[PDB]
Amino acid sequence: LPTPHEIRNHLDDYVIGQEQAKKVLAVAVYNHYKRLRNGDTSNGVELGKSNILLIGPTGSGKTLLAETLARLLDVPFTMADATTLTEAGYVGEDVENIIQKLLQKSDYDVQKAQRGIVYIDQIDKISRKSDNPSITRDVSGEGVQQALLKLIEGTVAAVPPQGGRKHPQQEFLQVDTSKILFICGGAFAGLDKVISHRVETGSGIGFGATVKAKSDKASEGELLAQVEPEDLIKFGLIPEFIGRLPVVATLNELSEEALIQILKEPKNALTKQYQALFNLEGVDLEFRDEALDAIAKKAMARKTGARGLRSIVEAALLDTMYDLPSMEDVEKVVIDESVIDGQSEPLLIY
Amino acid sequence: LPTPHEIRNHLDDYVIGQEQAKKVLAVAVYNHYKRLRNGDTSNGVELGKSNILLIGPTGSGKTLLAETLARLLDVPFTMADATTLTDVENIIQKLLQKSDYDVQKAQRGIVYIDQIDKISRKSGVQQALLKLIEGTVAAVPPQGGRKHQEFLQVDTSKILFICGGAFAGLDKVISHRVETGSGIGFGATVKAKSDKASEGELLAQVEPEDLIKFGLIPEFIGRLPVVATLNELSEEALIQILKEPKNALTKQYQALFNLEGVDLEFRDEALDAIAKKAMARKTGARGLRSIVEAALLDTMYDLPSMEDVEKVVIDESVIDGQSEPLLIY
Amino acid sequence: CGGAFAGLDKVISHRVETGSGIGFGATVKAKSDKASEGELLAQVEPEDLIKFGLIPEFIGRLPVVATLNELSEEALIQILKEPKNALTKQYQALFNLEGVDLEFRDEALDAIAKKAMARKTGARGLRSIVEAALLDTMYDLPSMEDVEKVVIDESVIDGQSEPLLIYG
Amino acid sequence: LVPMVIEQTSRGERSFDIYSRLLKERVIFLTGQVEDHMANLIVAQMLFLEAENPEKDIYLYINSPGGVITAGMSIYDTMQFIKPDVSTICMGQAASMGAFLLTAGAKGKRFCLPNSRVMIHQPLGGYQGQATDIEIHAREILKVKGRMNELMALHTGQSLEQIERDTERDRFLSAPEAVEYGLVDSILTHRN
Amino acid sequence: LVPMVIEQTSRGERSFDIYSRLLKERVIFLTGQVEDHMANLIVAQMLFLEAENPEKDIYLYINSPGGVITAGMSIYDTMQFIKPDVSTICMGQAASMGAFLLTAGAKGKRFCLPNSRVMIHQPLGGYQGQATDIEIHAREILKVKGRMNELMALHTGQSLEQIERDTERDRFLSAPEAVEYGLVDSILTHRN
Ligand SMILES: Nc1ncnc2c1ncn2[C@@H]1O[C@H](COP(=O)(O)OP(=O)(O)OP(O)(O)=S)[C@@H](O)[C@H]1O
Numbered sequence A: 001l002p003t004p005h006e007i008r009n010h011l012d013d014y015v016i017g018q019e020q021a022k023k024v025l026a027v028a029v030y031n032h033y034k035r036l037r038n039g040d041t042s043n044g045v046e047l048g049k050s051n052i053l054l055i056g057p058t059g060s061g062k063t064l065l066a067e068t069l070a071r072l073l074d075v076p077f078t079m080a081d082a083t084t085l086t087e088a089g090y091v092g093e094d095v096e097n098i099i100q101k102l103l104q105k106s107d108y109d110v111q112k113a114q115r116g117i118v119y120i121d122q123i124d125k126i127s128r129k130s131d132n133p134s135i136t137r138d139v140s141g142e143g144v145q146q147a148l149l150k151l152i153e154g155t156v157a158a159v160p161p162q163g164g165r166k167h168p169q170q171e172f173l174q175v176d177t178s179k180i181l182f183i184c185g186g187a188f189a190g191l192d193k194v195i196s197h198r199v200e201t202g203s204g205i206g207f208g209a210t211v212k213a214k215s216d217k218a219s220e221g222e223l224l225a226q227v228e229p230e231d232l233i234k235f236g237l238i239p240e241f242i243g244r245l246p247v248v249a250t251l252n253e254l255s256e257e258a259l260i261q262i263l264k265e266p267k268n269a270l271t272k273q274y275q276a277l278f279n280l281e282g283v284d285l286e287f288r289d290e291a292l293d294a295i296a297k298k299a300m301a302r303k304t305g306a307r308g309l310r311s312i313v314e315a316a317l318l319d320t321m322y323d324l325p326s327m328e329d330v331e332k333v334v335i336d337e338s339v340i341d342g343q344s345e346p347l348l349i350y
Numbered sequence B: 001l002p003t004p005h006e007i008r009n010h011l012d013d014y015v016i017g018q019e020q021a022k023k024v025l026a027v028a029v030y031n032h033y034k035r036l037r038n039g040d041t042s043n044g045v046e047l048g049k050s051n052i053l054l055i056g057p058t059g060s061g062k063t064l065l066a067e068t069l070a071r072l073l074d075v076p077f078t079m080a081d082a083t084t085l086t087d088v089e090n091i092i093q094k095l096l097q098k099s100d101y102d103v104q105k106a107q108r109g110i111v112y113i114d115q116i117d118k119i120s121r122k123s124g125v126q127q128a129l130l131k132l133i134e135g136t137v138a139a140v141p142p143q144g145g146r147k148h149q150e151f152l153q154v155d156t157s158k159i160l161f162i163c164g165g166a167f168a169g170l171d172k173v174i175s176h177r178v179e180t181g182s183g184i185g186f187g188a189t190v191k192a193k194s195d196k197a198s199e200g201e202l203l204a205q206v207e208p209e210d211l212i213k214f215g216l217i218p219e220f221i222g223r224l225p226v227v228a229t230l231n232e233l234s235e236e237a238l239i240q241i242l243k244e245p246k247n248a249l250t251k252q253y254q255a256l257f258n259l260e261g262v263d264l265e266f267r268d269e270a271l272d273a274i275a276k277k278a279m280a281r282k283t284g285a286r287g288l289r290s291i292v293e294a295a296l297l298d299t300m301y302d303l304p305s306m307e308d309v310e311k312v313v314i315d316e317s318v319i320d321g322q323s324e325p326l327l328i329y
Numbered sequence C: 001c002g003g004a005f006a007g008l009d010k011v012i013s014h015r016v017e018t019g020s021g022i023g024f025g026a027t028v029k030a031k032s033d034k035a036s037e038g039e040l041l042a043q044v045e046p047e048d049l050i051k052f053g054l055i056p057e058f059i060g061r062l063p064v065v066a067t068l069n070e071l072s073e074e075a076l077i078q079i080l081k082e083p084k085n086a087l088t089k090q091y092q093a094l095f096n097l098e099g100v101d102l103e104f105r106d107e108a109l110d111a112i113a114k115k116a117m118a119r120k121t122g123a124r125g126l127r128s129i130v131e132a133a134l135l136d137t138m139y140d141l142p143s144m145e146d147v148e149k150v151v152i153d154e155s156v157i158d159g160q161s162e163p164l165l166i167y168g
Numbered sequence D, E: 001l002v003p004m005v006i007e008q009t010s011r012g013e014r015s016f017d018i019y020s021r022l023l024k025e026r027v028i029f030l031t032g033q034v035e036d037h038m039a040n041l042i043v044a045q046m047l048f049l050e051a052e053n054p055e056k057d058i059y060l061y062i063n064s065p066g067g068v069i070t071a072g073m074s075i076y077d078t079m080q081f082i083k084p085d086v087s088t089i090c091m092g093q094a095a096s097m098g099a100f101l102l103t104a105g106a107k108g109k110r111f112c113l114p115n116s117r118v119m120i121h122q123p124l125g126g127y128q129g130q131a132t133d134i135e136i137h138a139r140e141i142l143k144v145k146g147r148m149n150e151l152m153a154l155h156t157g158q159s160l161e162q163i164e165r166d167t168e169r170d171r172f173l174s175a176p177e178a179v180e181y182g183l184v185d186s187i188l189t190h191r192n
């Protein structure tokens, strides 16, 4: 039922500056609903499932894409992690843990588990570490991928429903995994150097070679578009694991100017939250372009600038918020760039 | 209804050396109450949930803030704990019991969770509370039932939750991120033993990403964007906690001897030294009894045998232990 | 019990090769001109698996063995047409419910074969090539109306052209 | 002999030589006479740091009695070509060529130890052969002397005529005098 | 040849050379003649220890017949610049420059072995050329002698006039006499 154009229009409200990734995901999810909705008991049967592989820089909005999609989407969503997993009954974590976590979102309904979607972060962290004379059995490395192969393709694993009140139940449910979708994505480290050597030019250390002058001036994203499965082999991934994820996403980067868009265009932008918080009091909140620019530089300086907007904004308005109820006959509040630095106090209009 | 300025004055009687903490809670509490009382049909839809998580140093008084707020607030209060580890509905039941089976008033009641770090990712109850903070209904048998069967559904989306627990090793995780490298040459500066590594000025720069390194799930942290730092203690606080509160140990032991017809005295010259000893143990106010009881031990041991000792005075030297306390006849 | 073994050819190569001394008197044997992977695995025996790591007891319990040849450029073309559950037929049914037809010309399948081998992923890596081509189409197809047929040419795989759509 | 140290990292322990450890912190050592081999080795170190980070300051400690001119001029062009500010420090002694690379550092990031000593003189050379060949090599070395004085004045700010008079013979300059001469910016007596 | 030792750690066993093992404990060795290479290597060791711990005392064992002056003065300024107290010990012998680095250690943390021997004399030099150049190099070496005597008095506490008379020629000082002269603090006869 959901049309890719309609679902993309809704996602644009929550995502800024990422278009290629939206088209890729829209087709898959639409096919997934169609695959599960349509019985498919026709001449052609057992339709294949195109799993999605998301690639992008840290703090690019990957978690929001899955969660914001899950908010409007009816089916349940979960956020698992790959680093915790440890193969062959090791101390860290059994693979089966992912499935039991899904059931809580599905209220222990098997039919709802096939409908829902799963997301995994930090997938690059389990890249095949290749040190020959150390172990030769990398639990954190290659070994984990081998266990996920059968999981993604499809199999049934016993899962105690609800954990059981006590030994009395001692039963397990059979949960299919073929129809379940899997979204495995993580910010790969050092991948840009791998593709530069083989694709564009004789770059590097030397004089004529292009230096990394555009560390922050330009976005590396355009390079990721030319990524292919063969390049991931050098990274450590097994070809069998890559075959399980045919689709690929780019998610080039977030821009300083995009941060300004994130504060004004989105429905859940911080500006709209505080604006409504003060509107009820008969006060108006005004943000100036100079103030936004200062916020961008401060967020860029710290790690994961996208996740640090709350701290910068909250500290700036913490003092003003304390005195706003006490103050009377104040209808507007003005914030300046100097205030963001902390050397100035916001202007008050009566 | 109460404003940050007026609520601060009432809390100041029970709160000392935590001025900045009050600002975060005052705004959070007032913002939360208005969210429940507003139309909720304004342009600013899908308002982010405002939940506060306390940063707990050992024996930092977190329990005091909850009790003072709970006592001051007419709404019911409950003291839950994560020891249950699956059965969360019982916590909700406790609030209603105080509330006397009133869902309306219960909706306006805020609960505080202690020892939240006990359920960290060290091995999945956290996943169960995700459905609770985001809003859901849990079965609650009203009154327990006389014999063998219905349950009451009490909403949870609008109720506020205060999740806080004393985290261990959190300072080390923040140190790795905030150090931002160490230099070796002449021009580069070398840090001393402790310049910015103290608990103070280390939690203010904390962010959600640092909590992920500890074990917390982002879904749980996403529901609690707001965070308030709590100072551990200070020499002034320990001085005031032994004198201003009515239930201070100084007044307690003073009463212990009142029935025995003997008085006790504690000069300010003795308490400042006690403060330096408490911080060295890194145990807060709860570790204060070991210092006071150690000095009194020798005194209280031979006090019954002693006669004609109308009053006992405690000098600064007594805390040191070199000189015995002087007796007044 | 079956699973894709990695590096077994290197072990088989050492045993299948007779071996020779490097000195003057020792004779030299010219062998293994081509890898002949498919033809090399056929010469497998239990003793080679012992050096790989398997215990002889476990292999003794498995007397029979099966060697599978690696699919080639021509093998993929037949896999896309003759099998009933082929990916080509899957999309054909995907558009049949939509009131649109699908076609796969021989010129387009030949190019997919060369791209499939280039990614060293086998048949499982074929969906990456197909979905990458029909991406644009699948994005505006449901909204599109009065379309009765879709043809995928060789140019579409390279990306120079777009699939031809017929309106009816 | 070179001692080995251990650097603790999150991944694990790694063994490094004393010179390589400091190289990781953007620090290069210029020791002994300046020759074609020693100079060509420093150039690769500077370039390596440029790729790692072109925005971090580099520190170059110099303790050398000088040497070949052509080997030293390759380093001078490198410091000016690359974007990072090459900080220079004089330890022990800085001869004619060592002084030219010292003052060529970034303005405001040049230091000299309280007891260091700098010496400057004119280029040295010689030739044996026909009179026609002596005139050729004489004109060439004269251009270098003029070129070395022009660049020295550019960074020191002094006049070309003053540098010409001061470089006619050996001239020793104490650490305080270098500040008054514009050769350096300050002295790193103690850590602050 | 250098022997290899094994240091037991919680992570595992690690193999270290004898010099690197002692370096981990804030110990540096000054052996042989003082030259530009040997001096430039010790400076990097001090800086490495400063970053690891700036509050722990460093121990410097000196056994050397002296050498170049300019190479040694770079070490003296470094010891005074850094915050840690550089403990100095004289083993075997301490010549003119070795004695200057010995006495330059932190006050109260300077020791000399019961049978060690210290020798001090004036700077040595020489030049060949025109008379104008000899006068320049003579004034330069004279400043060093005056500067070296001023610092010796500062750390030893003696007067500049006394240091000038005692440094006119070679003067050997036994271990006990060094204490009476203010050059050292005590003698490490036995372990207590
Ligand atoms: N398109 C966007 N619109 C608005 N905010 C965004 C957007 N993209 C990122 N953000 C911000 O970035 C924060 C982090 O988003 P995430 O999806 O967690 O990024 P991330 O790259 O997935 O981080 P990881 O991979 O989980 S470590 C969000 O809480 C937003 O504040």
Ligand SMILES: Nc1ncnc2c1ncn2[C@@H]1O[C@H](COP(=O)(O)OP(=O)(O)O)[C@@H](O)[C@H]1O
Residues within 6 Å of the ligand: B014, B015, B016, B056, B057, B058, B059, B060, B061, B062, B063, B064, B166, B237, B241, B245, B285, B286
């Ligand atoms: N500012 C304060 N004023 C009065 N009492 C305090 C203050 N801070 C801490 N306390 C004391 O500390 C105790 C609470 O300790 P708490 O911080 O809850 O321990 P924990 O950190 O282990 O939970 C209370 O009994 C209270 O009397």
